[PDB]
Amino acid sequence: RAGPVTWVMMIACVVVFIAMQILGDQEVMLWLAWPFDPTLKFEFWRYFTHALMHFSLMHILFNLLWWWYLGGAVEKRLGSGKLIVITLISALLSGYVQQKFSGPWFGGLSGVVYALMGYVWLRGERDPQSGIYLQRGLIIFALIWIVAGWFDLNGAHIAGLAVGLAMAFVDSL
Ligand SMILES: *P(=O)(OC(C)C)OC(C)C
């Protein structure tokens, strides 16, 4: 079954998704979003919590489905700590880029999901010995949920994806 870190993310995403369904999306955003006024610049959870908000049933479900498989793989084969670093960096960076081009009003775990897709894939190609890899067919359906993100079927998913690849590079050495 699934490790403590994969578990918690899903829960928090769920609780927050529940929180969002009850209170309203603006209301939760008001507390969890990337900082949108300078009074909020010190509230350091905000650079991260944007990842926990999903806006539709299909948003959370796919992110969590992908998180479930990819996140859970890294944690089994490679450890809870590794998953934490990947999560922290990709949320910050994609969030930063997202915020920069579009604004502080966003959410979703897909920046992180992209990093995982890029990470697991490259790490399996360049370090097959480690027992990590993205299976062929999954590469296809992953390229889709990437394409889903890139044509709006916003921009900072390259950041998420980059971080994922960048880290897989380092560990292959
Ligand atoms: P992602 O969770 O969603 C894309 C699949 C559209 O969104 C960014 C803001 C992380």
Swiss-Prot record:
A single BP term in Gene Ontology: proteolysis
Membrane topology: Multi-pass membrane protein
Transmembrane is among the record's keywords: yes
Catalytic activities: Cleaves type-1 transmembrane domains using a catalytic dyad composed of serine and histidine that are contributed by different transmembrane domains
All ranges on the Periplasmic side of the membrane: 24-50, 99-100
Function description: Rhomboid-type serine protease that catalyzes intramembrane proteolysis.
UniProt record similarity statement: Belongs to the peptidase S54 family.
Record's protein name: Rhomboid protease GlpG
Organism field: Escherichia coli (strain K12)
Full protein segment contained here: 92 to 270 of 276
